[PDB]
Amino acid sequence: LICSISNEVPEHPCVSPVSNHVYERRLIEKYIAENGTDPINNQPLSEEQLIDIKVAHPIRPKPPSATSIPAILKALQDEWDAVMLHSFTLRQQLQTTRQELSHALYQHDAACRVIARLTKEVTAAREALATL
Amino acid sequence: LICSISNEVPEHPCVSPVSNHVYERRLIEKYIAENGTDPINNQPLSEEQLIDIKVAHPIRPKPPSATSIPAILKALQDEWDAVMLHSFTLRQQLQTTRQELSHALYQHDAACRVIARLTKEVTAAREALAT
Amino acid sequence: LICSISNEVPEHPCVSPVSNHVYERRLIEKYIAENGTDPINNQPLSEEQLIDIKVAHPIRPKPPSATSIPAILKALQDEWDAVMLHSFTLRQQLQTTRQELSHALYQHDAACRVIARLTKEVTAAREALATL
Amino acid sequence: LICSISNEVPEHPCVSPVSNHVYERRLIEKYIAENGTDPINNQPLSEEQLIDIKVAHPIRPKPPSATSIPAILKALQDEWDAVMLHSFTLRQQLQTTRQELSHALYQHDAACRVIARLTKEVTAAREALAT
Amino acid sequence: MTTEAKRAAKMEKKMKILLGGYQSRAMGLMKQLNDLWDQIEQAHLELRTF
Amino acid sequence: TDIMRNEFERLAARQPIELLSMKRYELPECVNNSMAQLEHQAVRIENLELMSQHGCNAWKVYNENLVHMIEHAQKELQKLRKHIQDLNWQRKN
């Protein structure tokens, strides 16, 4: 909603047929009279290139309505992407603490095994201590 | 401001080289590959002439309201149902104006059939007025 | 599902983050080790640049259907923005129908005074010749 | 193939040389705009360091009953309610994760202590026998 | 309302079979991948756990 | 850790109820909805044209690609089996 030279709000935004960039009437017409080209990349252009007049036509412009056609669908996509984004950062902890419980479970099982061996050793040991 | 194709605000506008016409990318590509002809100016089309058009400020979405989705759902339904009759409107009245055009040309074909008869009668009356 | 180099199915795919075009390992590894770049664009890359195909996340992955509200929004927008052009398809025909109707009405109103004058003159001149 | 942020199957794939990880352009834009780094590994990332991929244009078939009422009244409900129930069950899974992690830290405390005591008692009886 | 629904319900049901047999295909197609996504996230488990 | 959607979905999920859906274009104002059913079943015969244009063709187009995308995950499971079992083969000796 600004010009392509002077940054003012155009009353008839000008559109040139090389690198079309919404401009202002007086700015673009002046840049033409100064040199027959646009501001963007120094290509060729003519006076006829601008189709100035707004495009109001059977297109039936509605001053952008709140709840009619496109807004609900766009907002829905944006919010569903966010739902999935957060559920991802939750499934992160899901898998991570899975790995933690895996290591801890292997640890606790094979660790009670350490006692399963130690008890046999000490129980035979005190028995021998009484015996001999 | 206004796409001359879909009536939407296009974030993928495209301009043609034979025509000054910034159009929507969807319909532009669809028509371009469907047929070798242009939408409005009927300028014989090649796709690689396209100018990817952008105004890097202009994109203005709506902050309509905090309103619940129990609004937006029936909103989209009712808007589609309304645009359905609004799109039937543009074709029914066009078929009616076409029928009326053929009808008017038919009375035109009858009047320029009666005018020769009337001129014949007038010329004969004046030829009697000669004597 | 397809491969861009050998036309053989990638049973070990890796797409490099250079000119990513889904690539197979058993080709692209020696591809980068022979010429250190991507095939299509030829920007420089190697083995560590080419990256395996991996699982999405610990989030639940799912088949692609028109069910997902993003796919639902995509399909609904397809239908809508197509009816948007369908409206122009009839506004344009109305522009020609109504102009032809008004123009045939102009030629009709031009034949109307013609028939009125011819009909009045018929009576006038017939009565005058019969008045003798 | 799939995306590592939304768990989505992209029509818009873009992967970065900062983290070679197939991510959905939507969540990748959102993330790198939030904090200018990768989300998964977090090597600093600017949105123009990535590169898009050219996709095979993958499509899912429009089912036989696809229209306004099918894609509006029925269809959105399954998607939204299944996002609700899925995310709820996933947070429930995180709750179960915290519970099992606490139980596991308890079991590890038990293992460590009992092992510290029995490793002594064994060689204690052994030293008495070696007396 | 029904003038076209009687065709849009009819020609849809031309596909309620040929698409319907494939409708038994894409269902069990990704369904077995729920074991391939389990035994992947289970092959995500056994790798570093040992 | 998302947008106000967090409390919105908290309400909508704990509450449980489903938002009152798009039951407007169906029933039949009502004359608009009837004309809408007309144009919409016209678009339905259009999407039926665009479905029967393939028939079985673009169906098999998705089928073959589906299998050629399927096989890779199981190649990966083969990799994981081999790795873990050779680890155990070291552990034994």
XYZ file of C-alpha atoms in Angstrom:
669
model
C 0.000 0.000 0.000
C 2.839 2.378 -0.918
C 4.415 3.795 -4.071
C 7.395 2.348 -5.946
C 9.412 5.588 -5.899
C 8.154 8.039 -3.270
C 6.297 5.702 -0.852
C 3.037 7.658 -0.803
C -0.415 6.051 -0.783
C -1.430 5.982 -4.473
C -4.863 7.148 -5.619
C -4.316 5.270 -8.909
C -1.453 2.798 -8.337
C 0.566 2.458 -11.544
C 1.514 -0.925 -12.997
C 4.293 -1.253 -15.592
C 4.735 -4.312 -17.837
C 8.326 -5.351 -17.054
C 8.749 -5.835 -13.269
C 5.301 -4.616 -12.223
C 5.663 -2.708 -8.949
C 2.757 -0.751 -7.432
C 3.788 2.891 -7.851
C 2.240 6.353 -7.701
C 0.753 8.263 -10.625
C 2.931 11.388 -10.561
C 6.089 9.524 -9.516
C 5.868 6.894 -12.273
C 4.820 9.390 -14.965
C 7.719 11.640 -13.945
C 10.216 8.770 -13.966
C 8.943 8.035 -17.466
C 9.451 11.630 -18.649
C 12.922 11.514 -17.082
C 13.780 8.210 -18.787
C 11.453 5.739 -20.468
C 11.726 2.950 -17.909
C 10.685 1.770 -14.424
C 12.562 1.946 -11.089
C 13.364 -1.710 -10.453
C 16.093 -3.066 -12.740
C 16.676 -0.597 -15.639
C 14.904 -2.486 -18.447
C 12.968 -1.092 -21.442
C 9.451 0.348 -21.087
C 6.974 2.662 -22.843
C 4.306 5.188 -21.890
C 1.503 2.727 -22.703
C 2.860 0.075 -20.319
C 0.818 1.388 -17.385
C -2.788 0.272 -17.063
C -3.526 2.849 -14.371
C -7.264 2.525 -13.727
C -8.366 0.287 -10.860
C -9.748 -3.136 -11.741
C -13.254 -2.642 -10.282
C -15.560 -4.634 -12.579
C -18.076 -7.533 -12.446
C -15.553 -9.013 -9.966
C -17.854 -7.552 -7.281
C -15.406 -6.265 -4.637
C -16.564 -6.844 -1.059
C -14.740 -4.612 1.452
C -12.889 -7.553 2.924
C -15.562 -9.355 4.902
C -14.896 -10.869 8.297
C -16.511 -14.307 8.029
C -17.190 -15.104 4.407
C -14.966 -17.117 2.015
C -11.174 -17.192 2.468
C -10.385 -16.062 6.006
C -11.796 -19.131 7.773
C -9.836 -21.515 5.541
C -6.544 -19.630 5.861
C -6.905 -19.259 9.637
C -7.785 -22.955 9.887
C -4.597 -23.957 8.051
C -2.449 -21.654 10.194
C -3.899 -22.994 13.456
C -3.745 -26.658 12.414
C -0.057 -26.258 11.569
C 0.402 -24.845 15.086
C -1.508 -27.722 16.701
C 0.780 -30.179 14.907
C 3.822 -28.055 15.788
C 3.123 -28.300 19.520
C 2.133 -31.977 19.412
C 5.543 -32.541 17.806
C 7.379 -30.943 20.737
C 5.321 -33.207 23.003
C 6.133 -36.393 21.068
C 9.753 -35.309 21.463
C 9.552 -35.931 25.216
C 7.533 -39.075 24.466
C 10.417 -40.723 22.588
C 13.117 -39.203 24.815
C 11.675 -40.464 28.114
C 11.069 -43.753 26.317
C 14.845 -44.020 25.828
C 15.302 -43.036 29.490
C 12.951 -45.751 30.740
C 14.726 -48.217 28.443
C 18.162 -47.507 29.908
C 16.764 -47.397 33.458
C 14.942 -50.710 32.974
C 17.995 -52.506 31.613
C 19.903 -50.970 34.534
C 17.455 -52.099 37.238
C 17.062 -55.628 35.881
C 20.746 -56.393 35.257
C 21.444 -54.569 38.533
C 19.225 -56.828 40.633
C 21.192 -59.532 38.815
C 24.327 -58.193 40.534
C 22.658 -59.004 43.853
C 21.475 -62.362 42.512
C 25.167 -63.236 42.168
C 26.433 -61.448 45.299
C 23.920 -63.196 47.556
C 25.017 -66.633 46.350
C 28.659 -65.725 46.967
C 28.165 -64.319 50.480
C 25.763 -67.107 51.483
C 28.290 -69.777 50.539
C 31.012 -67.681 52.181
C 29.483 -67.480 55.666
C 28.553 -71.164 55.423
C 32.207 -72.052 54.767
C 33.145 -69.658 57.587
C 31.087 -71.786 59.969
C 32.195 -75.071 58.382
C 36.011 -74.957 58.305
C -5.882 -4.416 -5.661
C -8.270 -6.610 -7.691
C -7.531 -9.725 -9.722
C -9.389 -9.598 -13.048
C -9.715 -13.380 -12.918
C -11.018 -14.577 -9.547
C -11.970 -11.340 -7.685
C -9.468 -12.319 -4.977
C -6.298 -10.598 -3.780
C -3.592 -12.712 -5.466
C -0.241 -13.278 -3.793
C 0.997 -14.939 -7.012
C 0.123 -12.369 -9.683
C 1.475 -12.694 -13.209
C 1.628 -10.240 -16.125
C 1.591 -11.091 -19.822
C 3.957 -9.688 -22.497
C 1.376 -9.211 -25.248
C -1.187 -7.719 -22.850
C -1.045 -5.421 -19.856
C -2.804 -7.947 -17.619
C -1.676 -8.955 -14.120
C -3.590 -12.164 -13.404
C -3.814 -14.935 -10.807
C -1.255 -17.722 -11.130
C -3.828 -20.486 -10.700
C -6.161 -19.437 -13.518
C -3.274 -18.083 -15.613
C -1.434 -21.424 -15.684
C -4.691 -23.400 -15.970
C -5.957 -21.457 -18.997
C -2.459 -21.180 -20.501
C -1.945 -24.936 -20.621
C -5.605 -25.703 -21.389
C -5.660 -23.440 -24.456
C -3.224 -21.315 -26.416
C -5.227 -18.120 -25.965
C -5.296 -15.225 -23.510
C -8.123 -14.470 -21.067
C -9.268 -10.931 -21.936
C -7.268 -9.474 -24.848
C -7.243 -12.870 -26.649
C -3.512 -12.379 -27.370
C -2.040 -15.719 -28.511
C -0.301 -17.022 -25.449
C 3.079 -18.410 -24.485
C 3.682 -19.143 -20.812
C 7.359 -18.154 -20.566
C 6.357 -14.547 -21.299
C 4.991 -14.405 -17.750
C 6.151 -11.657 -15.400
C 6.023 -12.763 -11.773
C 4.351 -9.709 -10.249
C 4.610 -8.760 -6.583
C 3.966 -5.727 -4.400
C 5.920 -6.743 -1.333
C 3.874 -4.475 0.958
C 0.363 -5.103 -0.319
C -0.576 -8.407 1.393
C -3.280 -7.489 3.932
C -4.962 -10.387 5.769
C -8.003 -9.840 7.957
C -8.096 -9.760 11.737
C -11.887 -10.262 11.570
C -12.548 -11.044 15.241
C -11.817 -13.321 18.190
C -15.191 -14.956 17.338
C -15.550 -18.709 17.910
C -15.195 -21.271 15.096
C -18.879 -22.005 15.794
C -19.191 -18.805 13.786
C -16.665 -19.404 11.000
C -17.936 -22.876 10.039
C -21.529 -21.924 9.225
C -20.040 -18.677 7.886
C -18.086 -20.494 5.174
C -21.092 -22.712 4.469
C -23.499 -19.795 4.024
C -20.984 -17.809 1.964
C -20.466 -20.715 -0.436
C -24.228 -21.259 -0.712
C -24.728 -17.547 -1.443
C -21.960 -17.420 -4.054
C -23.569 -20.470 -5.683
C -26.756 -18.546 -6.507
C -24.623 -15.471 -7.279
C -22.754 -17.544 -9.898
C -25.972 -19.013 -11.301
C -27.139 -15.392 -11.542
C -24.402 -14.355 -13.981
C -25.183 -17.247 -16.366
C -28.992 -17.216 -16.277
C -29.266 -13.487 -17.001
C -26.620 -13.865 -19.720
C -28.619 -16.638 -21.406
C -31.684 -14.402 -21.088
C -29.963 -11.400 -22.686
C -28.743 -13.675 -25.491
C -32.258 -15.006 -26.091
C -33.565 -11.424 -26.113
C -30.819 -10.482 -28.600
C -31.877 -13.190 -31.057
C -35.500 -12.157 -30.446
C -34.753 -8.510 -31.275
C -32.848 -9.536 -34.402
C -35.951 -11.524 -35.432
C -38.241 -8.491 -35.269
C -35.431 -6.643 -37.068
C -35.629 -9.302 -39.779
C -39.395 -8.784 -40.032
C -39.307 -4.968 -40.172
C -36.716 -4.835 -42.974
C -38.991 -7.349 -44.726
C -42.054 -5.104 -44.460
C -40.214 -1.904 -45.451
C -39.682 -3.152 -49.021
C -43.418 -3.830 -49.344
C -44.291 -0.365 -48.065
C -41.788 1.275 -50.429
C -43.270 -0.712 -53.329
C -46.765 0.538 -52.486
C -45.463 4.109 -52.125
C -43.640 4.017 -55.467
C -46.751 2.682 -57.210
C -48.920 5.391 -55.636
C -46.461 8.045 -56.839
C -46.392 6.500 -60.325
C -50.164 6.904 -60.369
C -49.608 10.490 -59.189
C -47.505 10.877 -62.346
C -50.575 10.638 -64.601
C 8.831 -43.112 -5.479
C 10.907 -42.293 -8.580
C 14.595 -41.553 -9.186
C 16.017 -38.699 -11.246
C 19.339 -40.267 -12.312
C 19.257 -44.021 -12.995
C 15.458 -44.486 -13.326
C 15.901 -47.326 -10.828
C 13.926 -47.349 -7.570
C 15.918 -45.860 -4.658
C 16.057 -48.629 -2.058
C 18.296 -46.327 0.007
C 17.336 -42.726 -0.730
C 19.213 -39.606 0.342
C 18.309 -36.076 -0.773
C 21.147 -33.576 -0.393
C 20.449 -30.037 0.866
C 22.002 -28.406 -2.201
C 19.662 -28.801 -5.172
C 17.447 -31.321 -3.438
C 15.951 -33.693 -6.005
C 15.223 -36.952 -4.209
C 18.329 -39.028 -4.868
C 19.397 -42.631 -4.350
C 22.453 -43.487 -2.255
C 23.938 -46.208 -4.484
C 24.222 -43.573 -7.217
C 24.579 -40.200 -5.479
C 27.361 -41.255 -3.096
C 29.812 -41.929 -5.930
C 28.174 -38.989 -7.725
C 29.404 -36.527 -5.092
C 32.669 -38.424 -4.591
C 33.331 -38.123 -8.341
C 32.082 -34.600 -9.046
C 31.580 -32.652 -5.839
C 28.261 -31.002 -6.681
C 24.565 -31.686 -7.203
C 23.530 -33.214 -10.557
C 20.929 -30.754 -11.868
C 22.208 -27.364 -10.679
C 25.899 -28.246 -9.999
C 26.393 -26.506 -6.641
C 29.193 -28.006 -4.552
C 28.387 -30.864 -2.187
C 29.708 -34.209 -0.929
C 28.847 -37.177 1.274
C 28.286 -35.191 4.488
C 26.168 -32.832 2.365
C 23.955 -35.707 1.192
C 21.601 -36.699 3.997
C 19.607 -39.864 4.667
C 15.836 -40.216 4.398
C 14.558 -40.328 7.964
C 11.368 -40.666 9.983
C 9.322 -37.501 10.402
C 9.172 -37.220 14.187
C 7.988 -39.183 17.224
C 4.639 -37.643 16.339
C 2.204 -40.038 14.680
C 2.878 -40.235 10.908
C -0.082 -40.856 8.625
C -1.097 -41.582 5.024
C -1.902 -38.647 2.721
C -5.629 -38.283 1.992
C -8.139 -35.522 1.318
C -9.220 -35.989 4.947
C -6.690 -33.758 6.763
C -8.128 -30.285 7.384
C -5.161 -28.855 5.427
C -6.000 -31.084 2.449
C -9.683 -30.283 3.017
C -8.878 -26.567 2.870
C -6.802 -27.109 -0.285
C -9.656 -28.958 -2.049
C -12.328 -26.497 -0.903
C -10.155 -23.618 -2.144
C -9.725 -25.433 -5.457
C -13.504 -25.622 -5.906
C -14.011 -22.016 -4.753
C -11.288 -20.333 -6.828
C -12.525 -22.342 -9.814
C -16.088 -21.074 -9.384
C -14.460 -17.638 -9.169
C -13.418 -17.964 -12.820
C -16.730 -19.644 -13.673
C -18.426 -16.374 -12.678
C -16.282 -14.450 -15.177
C -17.164 -17.064 -17.807
C -20.762 -15.812 -17.567
C -20.193 -12.107 -16.884
C -18.260 -11.966 -20.159
C -21.073 -13.601 -22.135
C -23.493 -11.158 -20.482
C -21.359 -8.231 -21.670
C -21.879 -9.305 -25.300
C -25.489 -10.473 -24.955
C -26.674 -7.202 -23.385
C -24.793 -4.986 -25.858
C -26.177 -6.981 -28.793
C -29.641 -6.689 -27.230
C -29.413 -2.903 -26.844
C -27.965 -2.591 -30.364
C -30.703 -4.690 -31.959
C -33.095 -2.539 -29.936
C -31.553 0.552 -31.545
C -31.980 -0.912 -35.038
C -35.504 -1.960 -34.007
C -36.448 1.546 -32.853
C -34.920 2.772 -36.123
C -37.245 0.485 -38.067
C -40.150 1.432 -35.778
C -40.536 5.041 -36.949
C -39.898 3.638 -40.429
C -42.923 1.330 -40.169
C -45.038 4.055 -38.546
C -44.304 6.489 -41.393
C -44.743 3.853 -44.106
C -48.078 2.795 -42.589
C -49.371 6.356 -42.171
C -48.295 7.303 -45.696
C -50.051 4.228 -47.084
C -53.377 5.528 -45.737
C -52.626 9.135 -46.685
C -51.675 8.505 -50.323
C -54.295 5.790 -50.866
C -57.060 8.064 -49.568
C -55.714 10.954 -51.659
C -55.686 8.883 -54.855
C -59.153 7.585 -53.926
C -60.365 11.123 -53.180
C -60.185 12.062 -56.885
C 9.428 -37.514 2.289
C 7.708 -36.284 5.466
C 8.193 -33.227 7.657
C 9.860 -33.127 11.076
C 7.893 -30.203 12.543
C 4.191 -30.675 11.823
C 4.542 -34.400 11.061
C 3.110 -33.435 7.673
C 3.404 -34.807 4.131
C 4.451 -31.709 2.206
C 3.289 -30.210 -1.030
C 5.920 -27.545 -0.226
C 9.225 -29.210 0.694
C 12.281 -27.159 1.670
C 15.391 -28.445 3.485
C 18.212 -26.395 4.828
C 21.994 -26.731 4.617
C 21.905 -25.653 8.296
C 19.990 -28.800 9.229
C 19.447 -31.289 6.438
C 16.047 -32.330 7.758
C 12.943 -32.551 5.581
C 10.710 -29.910 7.168
C 7.357 -28.440 6.180
C 7.957 -24.970 4.722
C 5.108 -23.593 6.850
C 6.523 -24.622 10.237
C 10.071 -23.961 9.004
C 9.199 -20.353 8.142
C 7.357 -19.992 11.465
C 10.257 -21.474 13.459
C 13.206 -19.715 11.795
C 11.202 -16.508 12.185
C 10.582 -17.268 15.870
C 14.247 -17.937 16.667
C 16.744 -17.853 13.827
C 18.004 -21.411 14.189
C 17.082 -24.968 13.327
C 14.451 -26.505 15.633
C 15.752 -30.077 15.749
C 19.502 -29.557 16.191
C 19.612 -25.737 16.486
C 22.597 -24.826 14.382
C 21.960 -21.129 13.714
C 19.782 -20.760 10.638
C 18.615 -17.820 8.522
C 15.548 -18.429 6.384
C 17.515 -17.827 3.165
C 20.204 -20.392 4.004
C 17.835 -23.271 3.169
C 16.916 -24.481 -0.314
C 13.558 -25.734 -1.571
C 13.083 -29.111 -3.217
C 11.253 -29.651 -6.487
C 8.428 -32.045 -5.694
C 6.927 -34.830 -7.797
C 3.563 -33.052 -7.346
C 1.997 -35.750 -5.136
C -1.809 -35.921 -5.112
C -4.486 -37.760 -3.142
C -7.670 -38.708 -5.053
C -10.861 -36.709 -4.568
C -13.155 -39.345 -2.995
C -16.510 -40.086 -4.661
C -18.499 -37.981 -2.178
C -16.492 -34.750 -2.327
C -18.471 -31.492 -2.363
C -19.504 -28.588 -0.151
C -21.554 -30.644 2.340
C -19.094 -33.578 2.379
C -15.984 -31.407 2.846
C -17.781 -29.052 5.235
C -20.350 -30.771 7.497
C -18.800 -34.230 7.820
C -15.166 -33.877 6.832
C -13.796 -31.068 9.015
C -15.228 -32.717 12.139
C -13.145 -35.883 11.815
C -9.966 -33.843 11.269
C -10.505 -31.352 14.108
C -11.821 -33.868 16.659
C -8.995 -36.266 15.779
C -6.433 -33.503 16.251
C -8.054 -32.795 19.630
C -8.126 -36.425 20.797
C -4.660 -37.144 19.373
C -2.947 -34.185 21.056
C -4.805 -34.947 24.299
C -3.697 -38.594 24.243
C -0.146 -37.450 23.477
C -0.017 -35.151 26.507
C -1.451 -38.088 28.476
C 1.504 -40.088 27.151
C 3.857 -37.415 28.497
C 2.150 -37.718 31.904
C 2.717 -41.477 31.817
C 6.334 -40.732 30.847
C 6.893 -38.561 33.917
C 5.361 -41.266 36.137
C 7.521 -44.060 34.702
C 10.641 -41.859 34.894
C 10.027 -41.254 38.600
C 9.485 -44.980 39.192
C 12.701 -45.710 37.268
C 14.774 -43.254 39.300
C 13.372 -45.046 42.365
C 14.420 -48.463 41.031
C 17.898 -47.109 40.237
C 18.266 -45.748 43.766
C 17.334 -49.212 45.050
C 19.784 -51.026 42.775
C 22.694 -48.711 43.581
C 22.209 -48.895 47.350
C 21.591 -52.645 47.631
C 24.606 -53.284 45.385
C 26.795 -51.011 47.516
C 25.835 -53.050 50.583
C 26.092 -56.579 49.140
C 29.432 -55.967 47.392
C 30.720 -55.345 50.921
C 28.974 -58.212 52.737
C 30.351 -60.719 50.203
C 33.994 -59.755 50.611
C 33.394 -59.361 54.346
C 32.551 -63.039 54.759
C 35.401 -63.690 52.308
C 37.916 -61.820 54.483
C 36.702 -63.712 57.542
C 37.306 -66.979 55.671
C 40.714 -65.617 54.615
C 41.489 -64.979 58.280
C -31.616 -30.184 -6.201
C -32.308 -33.793 -7.215
C -32.125 -33.362 -11.013
C -28.334 -33.386 -10.762
C -28.021 -35.201 -7.420
C -29.652 -38.205 -9.112
C -26.671 -38.110 -11.474
C -24.075 -37.008 -8.905
C -25.254 -39.869 -6.690
C -25.374 -42.198 -9.709
C -22.027 -41.553 -11.417
C -20.470 -41.437 -7.959
C -21.775 -44.989 -7.491
C -20.150 -45.902 -10.795
C -16.963 -45.359 -8.766
C -18.287 -46.729 -5.455
C -16.991 -50.084 -6.742
C -13.875 -49.568 -8.896
C -12.608 -46.907 -6.506
C -14.188 -49.018 -3.758
C -11.958 -52.028 -4.359
C -8.992 -49.671 -4.272
C -10.699 -48.317 -1.146
C -9.821 -51.665 0.417
C -6.310 -51.119 -0.962
C -5.270 -47.740 0.471
C -6.812 -48.734 3.811
C -4.617 -51.771 4.440
C -1.815 -50.091 2.486
C -0.797 -47.562 5.153
C -2.361 -49.675 7.918
C 0.476 -52.211 7.856
C 2.799 -49.186 7.933
C 1.436 -48.647 11.444
C 3.585 -51.649 12.336
C 6.317 -50.252 10.076
C 5.985 -46.971 11.990
C 5.824 -48.876 15.279
C 8.734 -51.196 14.433
C 10.481 -48.035 13.229
C 9.880 -46.174 16.480
C 10.618 -49.547 18.040
C 13.714 -49.674 15.831
C 14.181 -46.195 17.257
C 14.151 -47.915 20.664
C 16.482 -50.915 20.409
C 19.332 -49.007 18.710
C 20.775 -46.900 21.541
C 19.030 -48.747 24.390
C 21.624 -51.523 24.126
C 3.210 -24.015 24.064
C 1.058 -22.731 21.194
C -1.283 -19.808 20.529
C -4.590 -19.058 22.327
C -5.601 -22.212 20.487
C -4.178 -23.809 23.652
C -7.093 -22.697 25.866
C -9.507 -22.841 22.929
C -8.733 -26.538 22.412
C -8.690 -27.025 26.177
C -12.308 -25.829 26.298
C -13.316 -27.653 23.107
C -11.744 -30.972 24.169
C -12.580 -31.087 27.899
C -16.100 -29.748 27.086
C -16.502 -32.398 24.600
C -18.876 -31.259 21.897
C -18.408 -30.764 18.159
C -18.787 -27.289 16.676
C -22.146 -26.837 14.945
C -21.215 -27.754 11.422
C -21.994 -26.556 7.895
C -25.612 -27.712 7.792
C -26.696 -24.818 5.602
C -26.115 -25.753 1.956
C -27.868 -29.097 2.456
C -31.486 -28.748 3.562
C -33.344 -25.770 1.858
C -32.296 -18.252 2.230
C -33.723 -21.675 1.412
C -34.221 -20.698 -2.241
C -30.557 -19.711 -2.239
C -29.709 -23.127 -0.769
C -31.811 -24.914 -3.422
C -30.181 -23.018 -6.287
C -26.919 -23.780 -4.474
C -27.661 -27.512 -4.506
C -28.228 -27.084 -8.255
C -24.876 -25.447 -9.038
C -23.129 -27.687 -6.496
C -24.339 -30.946 -8.022
C -23.300 -29.399 -11.332
C -19.807 -29.032 -9.854
C -20.282 -32.603 -8.607
C -20.852 -33.848 -12.150
C -17.793 -31.757 -13.062
C -15.654 -33.486 -10.411
C -17.233 -36.717 -11.671
C -15.981 -35.907 -15.164
C -12.572 -35.191 -13.613
C -12.705 -38.514 -11.727
C -13.889 -40.751 -14.567
C -11.254 -39.169 -16.824
C -8.886 -41.497 -14.988
C -11.140 -44.233 -13.642
C -8.590 -46.957 -12.868
C -5.642 -45.146 -14.465
C -4.678 -42.506 -11.886
C -5.774 -45.055 -9.266
C -3.017 -47.456 -10.313
C -0.760 -44.397 -10.667
C -1.062 -43.904 -6.903
C -0.949 -47.657 -6.144
C 2.454 -48.367 -7.721
C 4.024 -45.247 -6.195
C 2.588 -46.251 -2.823
C 4.389 -49.593 -2.869
C 7.631 -48.014 -4.137
C 7.457 -45.654 -1.155
C 6.555 -48.493 1.232
C 9.583 -50.752 0.749
C 12.204 -48.338 2.161
C 11.167 -48.364 5.827
C 11.532 -52.142 5.877
C 14.974 -51.825 4.317
C 15.736 -49.633 7.339
C 14.371 -52.260 9.740
C 16.733 -54.738 8.075
C 19.603 -52.351 8.827
C 18.534 -52.121 12.489
C 18.177 -55.894 12.868
C 21.677 -56.446 11.496
C 23.235 -53.790 13.747
C 21.628 -54.951 17.008
C 22.264 -58.639 16.349
C 25.952 -58.097 15.536
C 26.225 -56.074 18.749
C 24.879 -59.111 20.629
C 27.289 -61.334 18.665
C 30.169 -59.292 20.067
C 28.702 -59.310 23.595
C 28.538 -63.120 23.641
C 32.271 -63.772 23.190
